[PDB]
DNA sequence: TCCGCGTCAGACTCGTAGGATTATAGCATACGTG
DNA sequence: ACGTATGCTATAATGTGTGCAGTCTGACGCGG
């Protein structure tokens, strides 16, 4: 976004800097509990050959 | 087999070799009455599809859906990946002498020492009891051990906090990632239902007191005790074998 | 590549209770091998000794 | 091309004879008297009346292909016994039979525990008797509902309901969610666990070493009587064919044998501790 | 204000006047199974629709034929009350008017032959209660609304399906609601396709083949016109001014006179207007120009009579000198252009292999049926039977709505078929977005993503029973003889009811209700899915979906999904949003005319969201007239940035439209995270209510609306003073006004008490009225299991202190007082349901009586004769509730156990036992009991003592209806008497039986008199069938499964208290576990002396960022602070304005406060009882964004004599000297989830073992140990312990030998490792061998 | 032998929750065991 | 004798279809 989030959480976000900040979380929150299935299998194919 | 509830239960296998005794059966039957070809060979068309649903179900064409709308489970299915014998019913197992409760934090112990419940390690060490008890002669067969212990009767206390003594337990987090994922504490027998955990150790587990669960396990034999003092104790593994870099650190 | 260096392992056991278990099986079986146990996934299974 | 054994049967009874009323009698008059080809045309040529019929009896109990199959061999006992000289059409007559073998063998296949036809029979018409009631009841039929408007046993109506109870299959998921089946739940009957098997094995080296610890001749006519040393377990009359041979002295030892057995159980601390159980 | 307001005043800080008030929170659930079972007359909705659709239904003659006249819903069966108990549907009976008509077959249409009508039922329909909830075999359970890909068309590109080409490939598809998909794409070479159901792939001018359209038409319909003509010797060509734009001049261009463009140059847009306005219409070209181009239409040598050139080939010299000597100076060609109107179709036929219409329709049957050889109608049938059928397609409303809107067009409403004109229209806008003209729409834009609400799921499964009963009509009705054959014979109710039972319960979307809090009721029933059937799936969901997309602003709430693998899909809708009348969302918004920011609203669809700006709810309005600033903030087209005062057009009603239910509770919101905000709203719904519900000091204000339309409180219909107050019941005496002539006007309103929920935890509703007081309509009566005075109280407050503690609050680990512990405040109740079945067994009946074998005296104390336990008996884990007993078959009684027998005696009959016993581990009191048997055997005689009870309780409570109902009754005839004829004690003289007796003058009075005389009767004749229907379904006997013949349900209560181990969080996402229960004496303390009640970790603060949390321990300070002070002066007992001044001096404080309420206009006794419940603290409302600031909680917090900063001097418990430095110290409202440590700790030694994989079971709940998978494996085998493994392998898992033969070394001390090998790989040898393949143990 | 497109293989690890189907005639001798 | 199983009916009827269609990266295996 060309305009950022100017306040802190000491001053409290208006309705759309938390609708902004909405984006980044769940993204961030769904590569938690998707990706981690690539890296967990990862560790079951270098076990089976090591 | 019968469920409790006066209904039965079969396996989808059962189901499929129904499929293949019938069509061979009546393959049996249009060949003892000389039937035309053409139907002869929808019959072996037929008994081949019944084959290889029962060997592979999902796989030559669609898979033979059965009472819930779902595709019958075949032969090669119970061997085949996850859901099958290997992965899941012999490489994992659940394991007696094991029990799983919400950790907390034990800021008292010291790093070789863990919170165990009373009623937890009751019911875990129950045949430890069982053989202390005859030691003693408080029992004179098991089923009066069972029943002392069952009416926890104050000196049953005393006996299994004898037995739980210079024996440690191994403690596990979900998940296991790396061999730090278990280690082996001499269990500390505590009243309420909540595991006490070693701060320190906590790094390893990735463990965070906001409603962890631990699955404890006793190690049974004299030699499993050895390795649980030896290898898996809390003390013997300090570094991780990633890097030869201390996990136990304070936070 | 790890996922065919499992597969490689003339431990057969070792390499169906990885994965691609329908094919392993199949050209253990055409081939008639005989697994000797080395490898630990094996004599987990059978539950021997490591 | 076609890979699929539904329509490339269909396609080859798309290629057969569709028979005249005077063509039928020519061919089946030779049928009777075995013509050979005979029987096998009649049949080519009416496999495409037994798809129509087992078009109405799908989606029920067997597959379409299932139902053709068994449709095919009531058409052949059909052209077994057909009457070409009478004036009536085959077609008619085929059909009762087609009807009739499907039916019957929907009856047997469709069910995993084998259902005999007389326990079925009966089974439809208190369910037909359920379909009147519930329409003008507005509430499906009770088993007591369904014996009133029968007039017949309340235990018949409600054991042939208990026959129509279905199955669940024991890998059938939980919740509609793959995470565990019924037998990743469903207990052992038979094998209880190393605390019921070490039961019996401690309680009974116990028993052994009580009847070695008791006299001789008390626990040579009770541990062969209950069948416990012994390899039979005979009567107080019985014990007379090992070397006692008597009936009231057996009876006498028997009891004396038990008499300081229940004191040896009051002084070990069971007695009424163990008579709960 | 209201009566229950002045009780408590919340203090308001909003300053954004609610224009919009907080609608009914369920909505949603309500109104759309409103829809299925209302009988539309016309505009067919629901069942009406689903009856029209289908019938009328005829044979496959169609000599017969069955229509459908009308339906109706009978009242139910068993009511709400009494199906949660028995177990059965709260469904009503489904009575369907049919009509047989059959003609005549010769004649032309006899239709009046035989009329025969009759009625007739299919299936009983679960209706939905007052809550929003379904009833399911005795469970209230939700269905949830579904969220799917909305009908019609859409316009989709793989931005690279071979990224080997790296071409973004445009496809098109439409998307019915019923019928085949149809769906077309290009490829490598750009040549378009069609694919039906996405099958195979065939050319896309074969579908235009078979809706009849010659090659000409089809290049006549997408491509332009070239005109060609040969004048004389020189060759010309028409030119349109603005076509060689943006393309080179191949040769020179010139006109009648003038050279505009040079060979080998670019025609700019100045060389366009040069040619345009010179007006050129023709211009003379080479040969050399036409090699290349396309040639339209057909021409035919008019001598010969052949095809010279068939039409879309490409010309060349010598073709185009044929053509001019036939007798042809006037050619039509392709308008080919590379890059604006692109040659797709014409490239597209030279790969088309099909020739007419009828060929075009072989291949299209060659695709879905292939094998079958193909004939005229066959082909034909199956193309007009896809998309072209009133059967098989059906695009429905929205599906034609979007399908049209989508192509810009003509229609709103439409036909639910494909015409020939939408396929080529949808056909053309692909080639548009293809060309560089046209947006393809994005699926994760609500406009595209539809709502679907029970109501139409239910209409839907109603349709597939009426689809599997038309199959059993037709077919019975052509070979069945006409006449004997009655409809209802034809007809039959299972199909329906078993479709219908098949959506209320095994989909996906229902569920049981999560009630173990009004806030989980209420956002579970406002939950959405996108899940289930028609749906997408973890297995299938991709990242795009889940993101919040800008769309979800006002409709969907951004914070409010679960954080597992069903992440992004599940959602709950927003505060103020509301579906759309077709299906999409829409949210409210003030509609801004001529500057003037007006009260009028308007909820704005997710499609015209885009079109107008709308300023945010942060700008500032001057008091009617327009924002203050000139310069405004505001969004629009998904963006955001500042606008002018008449660029706007909308604006945000409120504050808290962006956010959900779940979220608009969380104060101070605002100050927290998103990904703790999401988990402290995830949090807040596991929130089990508490022992005494404790208002939060710290909240929104949305705690009243919530408590109030979750339905679990009970609210007045009508206001007036309550006649009476009772634990178990509510009296109210309407008022004159409100009150109908008509009846008497006593509302009755009996309270739920003490009973289970879907959880395992306690519902109360205890009166929060006192008696005889003067209540509003509409005013809160009773309370809830989590409500107070109305509003919803989830948790309860306390006194929190932020510091650690020696590592007893180490990684957000909790440290509680044993106070808190001692006011049992966070003390739990757990109501459990336990049963006990009488089944049939082969060897023969089970009965229940108190003969059990095998038992102590001990055991059957608590049970009576009959077998079943007292109530209010205490129970503990091995003591027996229901005595139960089944037969002992030919049983092999061992030589052991034969002499056992005989030794002790107590010879016990052929009897089995199967007592229901009280779960190891459990233990509470009994509150009720109750006994369900079949119409048949003879009962017990405890089942005789509660049928005692239900009935003189129901006659008693009959009997108090008809009383209260008569004294009502009479009171309203007493004031109708005095007017007239006045006169007062003479009247009352004589009994009140003798009243009807007594009349008036001819009046409108007189008329009321014979009303309420006449109905006093309707009552007095309505009590005995009243009286009837209660007394017959307690005589009744329950209908059960077969085998079972009676069943004893037994309620118990557990009291759990918080203990270590127990799960507890605010609303902030701030979890932890007890770690301890502090002594009081070691709890912290401030100078003035009360301690602490929760001691938090202030580094589960700034890692995590949800800072709400501090302010909600700030303000709840602050809040107490004000409390304390009231309190103090209610205990010195001082004065009425005293208190006055003070608590008006609290109210108004905030900079604009929205509330200003006036304590002169409250009466000294409306005061005293405000300020009794202010003294706990003055509760505090922080809207979600709209919230305090520092400014005024620094304000307050002076009002309350506390420190400005909020942190207090604290000292050490243990010790008594000071801690170091100041503490933060508060009042945070806490919770305690459900996730409770009696309900998780597990442990076996040995116990039940699997069926065929022979290791041990799963759970606590069927006693199973700790599953150790490989990884849990390969940590053994990294450490090097390879015993505690092959231990872990064998004897504890599968290993039959070794797990007994260990279990007898270990109770002899030899703990020796005896292994042999797992059951589990001797089944895996054998099923490798049931495969056909031989797997032999080869030894050394 | 190379390119296109069909099938076929995987997708972290442990805890907890609860529910239900349709229908196969109708009647008379043929085949198996106390 | 009781339970199960086998057997026949005669208007004419003669070729099925049914049901979820945002998975995806990566890897071969048959033709073309
Ligand atoms: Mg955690």
């Known amino acids: 976004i060309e305009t950022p989030i100017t306040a802190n959480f000491r001053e409290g976000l208006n309705v759309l800097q938390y609708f902004i900040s909405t984006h980044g979380a769940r993204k961030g929150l769904a590569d938690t509990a998707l990706k981690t299935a690539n890296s967990g299998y990862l560790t079951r194919r270098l076990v089976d050959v090591a | 087999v019968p469920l409790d509830g006066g209904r039965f239960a079969t396996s989808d296998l059962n189901d499929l070799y129904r499929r293949v005794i019938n069509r061979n059966n009546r393959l049996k039957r249009l060949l003892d009455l000389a039937a035309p070809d053409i139907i002869v060979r929808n019959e072996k068309r037929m008994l081949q599809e019944a084959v290889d649903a029962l060997l592979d179900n999902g796989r030559r064409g669609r898979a033979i859906t059965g009472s819930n709308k779902r595709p019958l489970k075949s032969l090669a299915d119970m061997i085949k990946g996850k859901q099958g014998r290997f992965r899941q019913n012999l490489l994992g197992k659940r394991v007696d002498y094991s029990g799983r409760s919400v950790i907390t934090v034990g800021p008292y112990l010291r790093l070789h020492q863990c919170g165990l419940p009373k009623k937890m390690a009751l019911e875990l060490f129950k045949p430890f009891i069982y053989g202390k008890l005859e030691l003693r002669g408080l029992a004179t067969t098991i089923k009066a051990a069972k029943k002392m212990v069952e009416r926890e009767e104050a000196v049953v206390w005393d006996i299994l906090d004898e037995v739980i003594r210079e024996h440690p337990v191994l403690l596990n987090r979900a998940p296991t990632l790396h061999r730090l994922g278990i280690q082996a504490f001499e269990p500390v027998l505590i009243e309420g239902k909540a595991i006490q955990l070693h701060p320190l150790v906590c790094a390893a587990y990735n463990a965070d007191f906001d409603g962890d669960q631990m699955a404890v396990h006793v190690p049974l034999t004299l030699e499993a005790q050895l390795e649980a003092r030896a290898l898996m104790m809390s003390t013997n593994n300090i570094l991780s074998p990633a890097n030869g870099e201390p996990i136990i650190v304070p936070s | 590549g790890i996922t065919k260096a499992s597969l490689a392992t003339e431990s057969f056991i070792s390499a169906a209770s990885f994965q691609e278990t329908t094919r392993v099986l199949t050209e253990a079986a055409v081939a008639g091998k005989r697994d000797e146990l080395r490898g630990l996934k094996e004599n987990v299974i059978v539950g021997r000794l490591i | ?277 | 204000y209201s009566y229950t307001e002045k009780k408590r005043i919340r203090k308001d800080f909003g300053k954004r006047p609610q224009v919009l008030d907080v609608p009914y929170l369920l909505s949603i659930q309500l109104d759309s199974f409103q829809k299925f079972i209302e009988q539309d007359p016309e505009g067919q909705y629901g069942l009406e629709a689903a009856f029209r659709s289908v019938f009328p239904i005829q044979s496959y003659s169609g000599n017969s034929e069955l229509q459908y006249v009308s339906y109706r819903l009978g009242e139910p069966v068993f009511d709400v009350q009494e199906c949660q108990i028995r177990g059965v549907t709260y469904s009503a009976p489904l009575r369907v008017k049919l009509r047989l008509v059959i003609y005549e077959r010769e004649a032309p249409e006899g239709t009046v032959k035989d009329i025969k009508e009759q009625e007739v039922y299919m299936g009983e329909i679960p209706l939905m209660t007052d809550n929003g909830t379904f009833v399911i075999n005795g469970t209230e359970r939700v269905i949830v609304s579904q969220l799917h890909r909305s009908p019609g068309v859409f316009f989709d590109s793989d931005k690279g399906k071979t990224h080997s080409s790296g071409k973004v490939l445009y496809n098109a598809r439409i998307i019915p609601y019923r019928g085949s998909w149809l769906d077309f794409e290009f490829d490598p070479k750009d040549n378009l396709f069609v694919r039906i159901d996405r099958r195979r792939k065939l050319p896309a001018t074969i579908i235009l083949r078979a809706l009849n359209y010659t090659t000409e038409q089809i290049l006549d319909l997408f491509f332009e016109k070239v005109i060609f003509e040969i004048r004389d010797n020189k060759l010309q060509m028409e030119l349109v001014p603005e076509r060689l734009r943006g393309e080179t001049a191949s040769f020179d261009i010139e006109a009648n006179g003038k050279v505009y463009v040079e060979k080998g140059r670019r025609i700019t847009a100045r060389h366009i207007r040069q040619l345009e306005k010179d007006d050129v219409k023709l211009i003379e070209v080479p040969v050399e120009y036409i090699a290349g181009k396309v040639v339209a239409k057909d021409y035919i040598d008019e001598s010969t009579g052949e095809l010279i050139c068939a039409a879309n080939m490409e010309l060349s010299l010598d073709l185009l000198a044929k053509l001019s000597q036939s007798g042809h100076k006037r050619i039509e060609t392709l308008f080919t252009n590379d890059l604006d109107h692109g040659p797709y179709i014409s490239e597209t036929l030279r790969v088309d292999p099909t020739n007419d219409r009828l060929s075009a329709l072989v291949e299209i049957y060659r695709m879905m049926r292939p094998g079958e050889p193909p004939t005229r109608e066959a082909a034909e049938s199956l193309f007009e039977n896809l998309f072209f059928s009133e059967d098989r397609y059906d695009l429905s409303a929205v599906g034609r709505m979007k399908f049209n809107r989508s192509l810009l067009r003509e229609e709103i409403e439409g036909s639910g078929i494909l015409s020939k004109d939408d396929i080529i229209d949808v056909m053309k806008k692909l080639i548009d977005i293809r060309n560089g003209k046209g947006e393809v729409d994005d699926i994760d834009h609500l406009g595209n993503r539809r709502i679907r609400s029970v109501g139409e799921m239910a209409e839907n499964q109603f349709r597939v029973g009426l689809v599997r009963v038309e199959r059993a009509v037709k077919e019975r009705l052509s070979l069945g003889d006409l006449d004997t054959l009655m409809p209802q014979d034809m007809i039959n109710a299972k199909p329906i009811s078993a479709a219908v039972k098949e959506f209320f319960g095994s989909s996906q979307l229902s569920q049981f209700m999560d009630q173990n809090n009004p806030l989980s009721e209420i956002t579970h029933k406002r939950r959405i899915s996108a899940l289930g059937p028609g749906g997408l799936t973890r297995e299938r969901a991709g990242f795009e979906v889940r993101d919040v997309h800008p769309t979800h602003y006002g409709r969907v709430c951004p914070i409010e999904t679960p954080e597992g693998p069903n992440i992004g899909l599940i959602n709950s809708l927003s505060v103020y949003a509301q579906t759309n009348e077709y299906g999409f969302l829409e949210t409210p918004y003030r509609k801004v005319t001529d500057g003037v920011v007006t009260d009028e609203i308007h909820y704005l669809s997710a499609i015209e969201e885009g079109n107008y700006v709308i300023a945010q709810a942060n700008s500032n309005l001057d008091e009617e007239g327009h924002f203050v600033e000139d310069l405004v903030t505001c969004r629009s087209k998904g963006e955001s940035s500042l606008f002018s005062r008449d660029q706007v057009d909308y604006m945000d009603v409120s504050t808290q439209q962006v956010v959900s239910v779940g979220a608009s509770l969380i104060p101070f919101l605002e100050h927290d995270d998103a990904n703790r905000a999401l988990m402290g709203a995830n949090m807040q719904r596991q929130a089990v209510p508490t022992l005494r519900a404790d208002k939060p000091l710290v909240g929104t204000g949305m705690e009243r609306a919530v408590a109030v339309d979750s339905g679990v409180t009970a609210v007045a219909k009508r206001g007036g003073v309550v006649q009476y107050v009772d634990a178990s019941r509510i009296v109210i005496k309407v008022n004159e006004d409100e009150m109908y002539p008509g009846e008497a006007g006593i509302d009755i309103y009996n309270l739920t008490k003490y009973t289970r929920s879907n959880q395992n935890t306690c519902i109360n509703q205890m009166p929060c009225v006192s008696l005889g007081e003067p209540v509003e309509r509409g005013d809160v009566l009773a309370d809830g299991p989590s409500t107070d005075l109305g509003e919803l109280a989830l948790g309860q407050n306390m006194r929190v202190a932020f510091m650690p503690w020696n590592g007893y609050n180490f990684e957000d680990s909790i440290l509680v007082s044993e106070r808190v512990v001692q006011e049992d405040r966070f003390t739990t109740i757990h109501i459990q349901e336990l049963a006990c079945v009488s089944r049939d067994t082969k060897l023969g009946p089970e009965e229940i009586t108190a003969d059990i074998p095998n038992v102590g005296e001990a055991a059957l104390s608590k049970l009576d004769e009959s077998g079943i336990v007292y109530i209010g008996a205490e129970v503990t884990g091995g003591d027996i509730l229901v005595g139960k007993v089944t037969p002992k078959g030919e049983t092999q009684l061992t030589p052991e156990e034969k002499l056992l027998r005989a030794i002790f005696g107590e010879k016990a009959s052929d009897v089995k036992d199967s007592s229901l016993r009280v779960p190891n581990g459990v233990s509470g009191t009994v509150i009720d009991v109750q006994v369900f048997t079949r119409d048949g055997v003879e009962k017990d005689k405890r089942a005789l003592e509660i049928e005692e009870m239900q009935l003189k309780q129901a006659k008693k409570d009959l009997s108090e209806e008809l009383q209260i109902l008569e004294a009502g009754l009479f009171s309203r005839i007493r004031a109708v008497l005095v007017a007239g004829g006045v006169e007062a004690e003479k009247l009352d003289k004589l009994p009140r039986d003798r009243w009807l007796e007594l009349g008036l003058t001819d009046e409108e009075k007189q008329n009321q008199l014979e009303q309420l005389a006449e109905q006093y009767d309707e009552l007095k004749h309505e009590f005995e069938k009243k009286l009837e229907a209660k007394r017959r379904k307690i005589t009744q006997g329950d209908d059960l499964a077969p085998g079972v013949l009676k069943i004893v349900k037994v309620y118990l209560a557990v009291k759990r208290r918080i203990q270590p181990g127990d799960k507890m969080a605010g609303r902030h996402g701030n979890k932890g576990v007890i770690s301890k229960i502090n002594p009081i004496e070691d709890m912290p303390y401030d100078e003035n002396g009360t301690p602490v009640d929760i001691v938090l970790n202030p580094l589960g603060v700034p890692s995590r960022m949800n800072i709400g949390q501090i302010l909600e321990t700030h303000l709840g300070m602050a809040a107490k602070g004000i409390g304390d002070k009231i309190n103090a002066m209610l205990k010195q007992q001082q004065e009425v304005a005293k208190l006055r001044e003070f608590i008006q001096r609290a109210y108004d404080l905030g900079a604009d406060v929205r509330q200003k309420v006036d304590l002169s206009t409250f009466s000294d006794e409306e005061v005293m009882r405000l300020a009794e419940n202010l003294r706990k603290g003055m509760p505090i409302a922080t809207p979600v964004f709209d919230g305090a600031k520092e400014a005024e909680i620094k304000e307050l917090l002076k009002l309350g004599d506390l420190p400005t900063s909020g942190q207090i001097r604290l000292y050490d418990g243990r010790t008594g000297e000071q801690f170091e430095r100041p503490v933060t110290v508060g009042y945070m409202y806490m919770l305690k989830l459900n996730h409770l440590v009696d309900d998780k700790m597990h442990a076996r030694s040995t116990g039940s073992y699997s069926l065929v994989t022979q290791q041990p079971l799963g759970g606590k709940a069927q006693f199973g140990g700790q599953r150790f998978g490989e990884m849990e494996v390969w940590a053994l085998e990294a450490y090097g312990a390879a015993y505690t493994l092959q231990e872990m392998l064998t004897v504890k898992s599968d290993d039959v030998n070794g797990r007994t033969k260990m279990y007898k070394n270990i109770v002899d001390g030899n703990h020796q490792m005896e292994p042999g090998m797992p059951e589990s790989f001797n089944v895996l040898l054998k099923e490798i061998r049931s495969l056909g393949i031989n797997i032999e143990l080869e030894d050394e």
């Open chain 4, 1 to 277: 091309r076609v890979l699929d054994a539904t329509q490339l049967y269909l396609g080859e009874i798309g290629y057969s004879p569709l028979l005249t009323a005077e063509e039928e009698v020519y061919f089946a008059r030779r049928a009777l008297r075995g013509d050979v080809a005979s029987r096998r045309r009649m049949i080519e040529s009416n496999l495409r009346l037994v798809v129509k019929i087992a078009r109405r009896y799908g989606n029920r109990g067997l597959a379409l292909l299932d139902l053709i199959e068994e449709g095919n061999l009531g058409l052949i006992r059909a052209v077994e016994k057909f009457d070409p000289e009478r004036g009536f059409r085959f077609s008619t007559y085929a059909t009762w039979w087609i009807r009739q073998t499907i039916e019957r063998a929907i009856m047997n296949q469709t069910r995993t525990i084998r259902l005999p036809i007389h326990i079925v029979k009966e089974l439809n018409v208190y369910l037909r008797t359920a379909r009147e009631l519930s329409h003008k009841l507005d509430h499906e039929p009770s088993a007591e509902e369904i014996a009133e408007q029968l007039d017949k046993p309340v235990d018949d109506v409600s054991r042939m309901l208990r026959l129509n109870e279905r199955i669940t299959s024991v890998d059938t998921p939980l919740g509609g969610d793959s995470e565990k089946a019924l037998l990743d739940i469903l207990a052992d009957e038979k094998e209880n666990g190393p605390e019921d098997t070490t039961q019996d094995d401690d309680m009974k080296q116990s028993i052994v070493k009580w009847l070695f610890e008791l006299n001789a001749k008390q626990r040579e006519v009770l541990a062969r009587r209950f069948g416990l040393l012994g390899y039979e377990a005979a009567t107080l009359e019985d014990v007379g064919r090992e070397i006692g041979l008597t009936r009231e002295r057996v009876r006498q030892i028997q009891v004396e044998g038990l008499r300081r057995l229940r004191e040896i159980l009051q002084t070990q601390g069971l007695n009424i501790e163990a008579l709960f159980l």
